[PDB]
Amino acid sequence: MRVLVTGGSGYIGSHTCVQLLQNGHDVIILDNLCNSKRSVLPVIERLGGKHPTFVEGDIRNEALMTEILHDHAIDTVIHFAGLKAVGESVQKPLEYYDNNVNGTLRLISAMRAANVKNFIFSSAATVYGDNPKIPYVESFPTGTPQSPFGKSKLMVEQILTDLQKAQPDWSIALLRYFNPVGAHPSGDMGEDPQGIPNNLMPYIAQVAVGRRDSLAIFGNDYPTEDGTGVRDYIHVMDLADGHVVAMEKLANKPGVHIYNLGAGVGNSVLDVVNAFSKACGKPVNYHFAPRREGDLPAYWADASKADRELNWRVTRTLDEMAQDTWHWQSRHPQGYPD
Amino acid sequence: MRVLVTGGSGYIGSHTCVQLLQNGHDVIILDNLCNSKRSVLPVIERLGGKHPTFVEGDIRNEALMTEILHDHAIDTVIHFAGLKAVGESVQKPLEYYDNNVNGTLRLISAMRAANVKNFIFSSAATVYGDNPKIPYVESFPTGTPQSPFGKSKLMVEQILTDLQKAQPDWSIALLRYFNPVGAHPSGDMGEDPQGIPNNLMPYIAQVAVGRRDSLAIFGNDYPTEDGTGVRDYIHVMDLADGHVVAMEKLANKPGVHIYNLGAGVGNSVLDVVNAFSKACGKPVNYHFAPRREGDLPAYWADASKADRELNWRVTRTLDEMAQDTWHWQSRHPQGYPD
Numbered sequence: 097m098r099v100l101v102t103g104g105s106g107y108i109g110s111h112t113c114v115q116l117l118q119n120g121h122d123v124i125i126l127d128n129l130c131n132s133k134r135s136v137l138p139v140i141e142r143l144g145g146k147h148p149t150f151v152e153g154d155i156r157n158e159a160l161m162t163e164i165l166h167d168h169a170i171d172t173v174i175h176f177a178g179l180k181a182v183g184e185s186v187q188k189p190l191e192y193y194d195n196n197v198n199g200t201l202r203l204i205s206a207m208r209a210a211n212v213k214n215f216i217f218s219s220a221a222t223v224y225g226d227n228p229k230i231p232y233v234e235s236f237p238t239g240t241p242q243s244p245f246g247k248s249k250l251m252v253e254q255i256l257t258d259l260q261k262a263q264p265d266w267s268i269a270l271l272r273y274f275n276p277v278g279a280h281p282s283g284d285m286g287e288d289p290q291g292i293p294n295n296l297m298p299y300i301a302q303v304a305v306g307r308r309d310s311l312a313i314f315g316n317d318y319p320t321e322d323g324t325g326v327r328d329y330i331h332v333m334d335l336a337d338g339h340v341v342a343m344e345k346l347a348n349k350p351g352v353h354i355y356n357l358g359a360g361v362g363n364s365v366l367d368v369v370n371a372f373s374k375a376c377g378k379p380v381n382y383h384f385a386p387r388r389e390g391d392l393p394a395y396w397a398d399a400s401k402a403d404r405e406l407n408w409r410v411t412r413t414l415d416e417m418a419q420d421t422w423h424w425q426s427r428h429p430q431g432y433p434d
Numbered sequence: 435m436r437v438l439v440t441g442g443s444g445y446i447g448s449h450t451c452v453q454l455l456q457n458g459h460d461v462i463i464l465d466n467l468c469n470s471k472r473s474v475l476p477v478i479e480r481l482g483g484k485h486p487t488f489v490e491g492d493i494r495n496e497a498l499m500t501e502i503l504h505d506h507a508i509d510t511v512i513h514f515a516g517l518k519a520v521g522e523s524v525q526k527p528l529e530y531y532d533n534n535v536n537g538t539l540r541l542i543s544a545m546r547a548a549n550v551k552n553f554i555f556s557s558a559a560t561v562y563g564d565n566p567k568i569p570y571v572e573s574f575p576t577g578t579p580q581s582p583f584g585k586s587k588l589m590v591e592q593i594l595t596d597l598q599k600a601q602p603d604w605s606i607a608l609l610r611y612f613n614p615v616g617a618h619p620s621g622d623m624g625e626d627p628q629g630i631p632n633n634l635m636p637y638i639a640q641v642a643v644g645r646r647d648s649l650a651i652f653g654n655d656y657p658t659e660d661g662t663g664v665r666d667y668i669h670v671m672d673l674a675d676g677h678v679v680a681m682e683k684l685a686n687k688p689g690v691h692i693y694n695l696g697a698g699v700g701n702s703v704l705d706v707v708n709a710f711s712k713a714c715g716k717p718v719n720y721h722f723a724p725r726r727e728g729d730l731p732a733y734w735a736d737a738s739k740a741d742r743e744l745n746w747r748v749t750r751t752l753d754e755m756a757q758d759t760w761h762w763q764s765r766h767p768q769g770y771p772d
């Protein structure tokens with residue numbers, strides 16, 4: 097199929113792009129490069145084994161969106177583009193609402209204009225809010241995210257839902273992601289955060305690589321087995337695969353298809369650390385720090401639905417997630433070149 | 435003070451503009467005229483007894499907003515501008531999200547740019563969602579509005595809240611309106627809906643004026659005293675006054691000030707009809723019809739908070755609401771001139 101991948105050059109997008117090309121689809125990448133580099137492009141094509149078309153631009157530019165859509169005869173759109181730093185969203189709410197809410201709004205409006213009716217949105221587990229009921233299931237009513245980032249994702253899911261209701265021919269998938277980690281097995285592609293990494297994995301990686309001193313373990317008094325926070329870590333390649341399957345099986349299938357994308361099991365901070373220590377061949381330095389504001393104690397996804405309906409489930413393990421990360425971190429200490 | 439009134443030429447805005455001028459404030463009206471006419475302008479100035487400056491434009495145009503803000507040295511902004519047809523919002527969700535959510539976003543972004551930090555937003559009782567607890571109180575957590583319109587209002591309240599948190603010097607009032615009716619005592623200003631009126635009052639008016647046959651009473655089996663739906667009707671002049679007081683007392687007072695704006699009592703459909711029959715000197719034709727989709731049975735506001743904190747309460751009665759409407763309807767059967 098002909099697919100437009102917004103945010104195609106970022107972490108999740110790049111991996112998804114490779115899988116898509118491998119599946120022989122025609123890929124058009126639209127990215128504004130605020131959080132990625134042109135350097136990834138050649139890697140995508142190499143790994144993907146096919147040439148993806150790249151367009152530098154902003155999802156906020158409806159006129160350009162509309163033009164791309166038409167110009168390439170897009171069939172479906174995968175929307176990864178936006179801002180995701182939680183803490184920063186609290187400090188700069190407007191930018192989040194603008195990039196995420198208005199950003200998606202301008203894109204779907206362009207779609208309407210070009211007669212494109214298949215969409216895939218990068219959502220998040222955050223939309224469940226403070227849910228005591230774990231694992232999280234798609235049948236659960238949504239809650240209230242505590243950050244402008246989380247709120248922005250829920251607001252878009254709502255806007256998409258309403259849009260589908262009004263234009264019932266649309267196929268819209270709301271993919272709720274859990275905690276994406278890992279990198280391409282090649283070790284030539286991976287997450288390349290600028291500055292201080294906000295997520296656990298990259299931070300660990302940066303400690304291991306010798307860039308950082310010690311990993312600060314946000315709270316050790318949680319009501320978990322080991323006292324550290326528990327999450328659902330999902331390999332970026334598994335995530336990418338799920339994106340290809342969702343796209344292929346859902347295209348032209350009217351409705352709003354919500355699916356949690358996770359491993360369906362929880363791992364603590366200690367578990368992750370240990371896995372990385374193992375991967376990198378040296379104990380990862382760490383210390384216990386106070387709980388991070390807004391952090392829930394433990395949650396993971398109930399991924400039965402995606403298994404059942406799309407025959408999708410993860411295949412990579414936690415160890416692989418850590419190994420692949422170390423391999424990329426180690427092979428490209430400076431990430432993507434400028 | 436120097437105030438920018440978006441949507442200044444519409445129903446609520448025009449009345450508010452008069453009261454503001456009467457209070458000697460300097461008024462700048464910004465309206466795109468999608469739901470109002472330039473004809474109202476001279477009425478505003480006449481009734482207001484002062485000249486308001488008018489600018490034709492769109493809240494969506496951030497650059498223009500920014501320019502107005504600076505250009506007139508605005509101190510505070512009253513934001514009435516947006517779309518409000520509930521049923522239509524269900525049919526055209528994108529337009530609602532765009533005008534309301536993006537629309538406000540572009541405006542507050544312009545404010546930030548021009549260093550304006552006092553805001554008044556036209557919110558709605560709809561934000562409480564399906565609340566069995568009546569009357570509705572500001573301390574109640576918000577619910578989930580069932581239309582894109584309702585959702586759009588809640589989304590903006592959330593975005594404003596987050597913004598205030600990030601820029602704590604801002605004063606933001608979230609004015610939750612109940613059911614606005616009535617018109618200026620002069621009978622020379624009032625609500626001028628185009629096409630089929632969606633609200634009860636105007637519809638009644640149009641039946642009385644001889645434009646419409648019979649009023650369709652949406653459901654007569656509700657669990658109310660008379661079986662018809664019960665609401666909190668609030669005279670547009672009371673509403674306008676509350677806007678002046680809120681603006682004057684809240685300016686430069688940091689925080690998010692939420693206030694319900696209603697009479698604090700409920701009236702049924704029958705009650706309203708009767709009041710209008712009385713006002714117009716002839717029985718208003720009506721019939722019973724099935725319940726309207728999404729209609730709640732009964733609710734009204736708990737307006738104690740505004741009384742206490744701003745010393746504001748309504749002063750007009752239901753009869754006056756009906757009389758003033760009939761007077762305007764009758765004196766200007768064709769509304770504002772083209």
Ligand SMILES: NC(=O)c1ccc[n+]([C@@H]2O[C@H](COP(=O)([O-])OP(=O)(O)OC[C@H]3O[C@@H](n4cnc5c(N)ncnc54)[C@H](O)[C@@H]3O)[C@@H](O)[C@H]2O)c1
Binds near residue numbers: 155273274275
């Ligand atoms: N990484 C996670 O932990 C996490 C968890 C849940 C959801 N998500 C969502 O998944 C998506 C992909 O995230 P990611 O980890 O790949 O992050 P990322 O930053 O690597 O990818 C986002 C990409 O979007 C681009 N972009 C940003 N705003 C843009 C705009 N207005 N116009 C055009 N391009 C724009 C960035 O330059 C970047 O290349 C995002 O929507 C993110 O919110 C990720």
Ligand SMILES: NC(=O)c1ccc[n+]([C@@H]2O[C@H](COP(=O)([O-])OP(=O)(O)OC[C@H]3O[C@@H](n4cnc5c(N)ncnc54)[C@H](O)[C@@H]3O)[C@@H](O)[C@H]2O)c1
Binds near residue numbers: 446494
């Ligand atoms: N009337 C009600 O029953 C009701 C109840 C709750 C909330 N509200 C809110 O109060 C506000 C005022 O409502 P109203 O009854 O006066 O309606 P209205 O339609 O008379 O007033 C809105 C005005 O905004 C203008 N406008 C619309 N979109 C615009 C845009 N993008 N840029 C610039 N101008 C724009 C319209 O032309 C109109 O003059 C609205 O935000 C409405 O949502 C009203």
Ligand SMILES: O=c1ccn([C@@H]2O[C@H](COP(=O)(O)OP(=O)(O)O[C@H]3O[C@H](CO)[C@H](O)[C@H](O)[C@H]3O)[C@@H](O)[C@H]2O)c(=O)[nH]1
Binds near residue numbers: 295315327
């Ligand atoms: O330096 C660090 C970083 C993280 N953690 C802990 O590690 C766990 C994972 O934290 P993190 O990588 O930041 O991800 P999450 O907060 O769990 O990610 C959630 O939030 C993302 C952004 O909101 C998406 O919504 C995902 O779906 C969601 O599961 C948590 O228990 C953190 O307390 C630390 O102890 N130290």
Ligand SMILES: O=c1ccn([C@@H]2O[C@H](COP(=O)(O)OP(=O)(O)O[C@H]3O[C@H](CO)[C@H](O)[C@H](O)[C@H]3O)[C@@H](O)[C@H]2O)c(=O)[nH]1
Binds near residue numbers: 583611634637
């Ligand atoms: O032709 C009509 C019109 C209305 N009604 C009834 O009259 C009452 C009032 O209806 P309406 O004027 O449409 O206003 P509301 O739906 O009550 O207004 C609510 O919704 C507005 C738009 O959402 C704002 O949120 C207000 O705060 C809020 O109280 C309801 O019981 C309706 O069922 C009829 O029976 N026939």
Ligand code: NA
Binds near residue numbers: 186600601
């Ligand atoms: Na801050």
Ligand code: NA
Binds near residue numbers: 292
């Ligand atoms: Na960064």
Ligand code: NA
Binds near residue numbers: 431432
């Ligand atoms: Na680098």
Ligand code: NA
Binds near residue numbers: 261262263524525
């Ligand atoms: Na429809």
Ligand code: NA
Binds near residue numbers: 627628630
């Ligand atoms: Na109309």
Ligand code: NA
Binds near residue numbers: 768769771
């Ligand atoms: Na007219």
